[PDB]
Structure 1
Amino acid sequence: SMGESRVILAFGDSLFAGYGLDKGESYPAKLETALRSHGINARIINAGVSGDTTAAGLQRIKFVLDSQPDKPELAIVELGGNDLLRGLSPAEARQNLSGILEELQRRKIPILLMGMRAPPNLGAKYQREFDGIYPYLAEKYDAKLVPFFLEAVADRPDLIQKDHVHPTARGVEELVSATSNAVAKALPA
């Protein structure tokens, strides 16, 4: 094909940074290769930062854009999962994301928003509130939306890395039942 590559900014968290993966296995890297099958030569800027909240993304979006030698032709925004992991306000996550999208819109950079979904642990009230921020933002900022970015691995534990193992309340009870003898024995009489 003719021409310089198309520049795409992948602005996200550990799901874009490729946490736990080897060189070339992150989503941005594999997406760049896959877009050749759509007739597109892309250079995808991996602006994934592991652990970034929406507030962290807002803090760096201007710097990341000003750092680019070539202006992005599309920005993919994938943030909010770490807000959920911290149990942080969904409203504040929406506000922070709004500031990120507003900066991209000022610069006339098209936006694709990756929708995040809350697990049931924080409860239905929180989950509904969190989940709804993404359709709200896509409409308000005229962004395209992937409603559920992680949908293709939702039902596939075999496609999810084993790393953090946080017991449920019932799991804690199991740990206590297995280890209390050792604790009692270690405590001097």
Structure 2
Amino acid sequence: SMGESRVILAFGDALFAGYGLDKGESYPAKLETALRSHGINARIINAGVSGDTTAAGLQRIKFVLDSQPDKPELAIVELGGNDLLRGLSPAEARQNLSGILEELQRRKIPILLMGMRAPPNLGAKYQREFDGIYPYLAEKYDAKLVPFFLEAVADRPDLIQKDHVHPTARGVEELVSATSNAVAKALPA
């Protein structure tokens, strides 16, 4: 092909940063290769930061855009998972993401929003509220939405890293049954 690469900003959290993966295995790195098959030579700016909340993304979006030598031609926004993991207000996550999209829209940078979904642990009220923020934002900011970014791995535990292992309430009971003897023995009589 002739010409310089198309510049895409991948603005996100651990899922963009490539947490737990080797060089070149991250989603942005593999997406850059895959777009060659669409006839596109892209340079994808990896602005993934592991553990970023929507508030942390809002805090840095201007800095990240002002740091670019070449203005992004598309910004892919993937945040809210860490808000979920901290049980933070869905309303505040919506407000934070709105601030990020407003800054992109001010600069006339097209937006692709990666939809996040809440697991059942947070309960149905929280899950419905959180899940609804992404279509709301996509409509409000005229953004393209991928409704469920992690849909392709949702039923594929073989495609998910083993990392954090937080027991359920029943799992805690299991651990107590296994370890109470050792605790009772360790405590002086």
TM-score range (shorter-chain normalised) is: over 0.9
Q: Which residue of 1 aligns with 2:119?
A: 119
Give the drift of 1:161. Answer: 0.1
Q: Secondary structure at the match of 2:37?
A: helix
Identity %: 99
**Counterpart Cα distance in 2 of 1:95 and 1:137:** 9
TM-score by length of 1: 1.00
Q: Which residue of 2 aligns with 1:54?
A: 54
**Counterpart Cα distance in 2 of 1:170 and 1:19:** 29
For residues 92-114 of structure 1, the C-alpha deviation after alignment (integer angstroms, 9 at most, x for no partner) is 00000000000000000000000
**Counterpart Cα distance in 2 of 1:50 and 1:97:** 17
Q: Which residue of 1 aligns with 2:148?
A: 148
Give the drift of 1:61. Answer: 0.1
Give the drift of 1:52. Answer: 0.1
For residues 124-143 of structure 1, the C-alpha deviation after alignment (integer angstroms, 9 at most, x for no partner) is 00000000000000000000
**Counterpart Cα distance in 2 of 1:169 and 1:26:** 33
**Counterpart Cα distance in 1 of 2:188 and 2:34:** 62
Give the drift of 1:25. Answer: 0.2
Q: Compute the RMSD of aligned alpha carbons.
A: 0.2
Q: Which residue of 1 aligns with 2:70?
A: 70
**Counterpart Cα distance in 2 of 1:64 and 1:116:** 22
Q: Secondary structure at the match of 2:30?
A: helix
Give the drift of 1:50. Answer: 0.1
Q: Which residue of 2 aligns with 1:101?
A: 101
Q: Secondary structure at the match of 1:50?
A: coil
Q: Secondary structure at the match of 1:38?
A: coil
Structure 1 segments of 4+ aligned residues over 4 angstroms from their partners: none
Give the drift of 1:77. Answer: 0.0
Matches within 5 A, 1:163-174: 163-174=163-174
Give the drift of 1:38. Answer: 0.2
Give the drift of 1:156. Answer: 0.1
Listed as ranges, the gaps of 5+ residues in structure 2 are none
Give the drift of 1:74. Answer: 0.1
**Counterpart Cα distance in 1 of 2:8 and 2:179:** 51
Give the drift of 1:12. Answer: 0.0
Listed as ranges, the gaps of 5+ residues in structure 1 are none
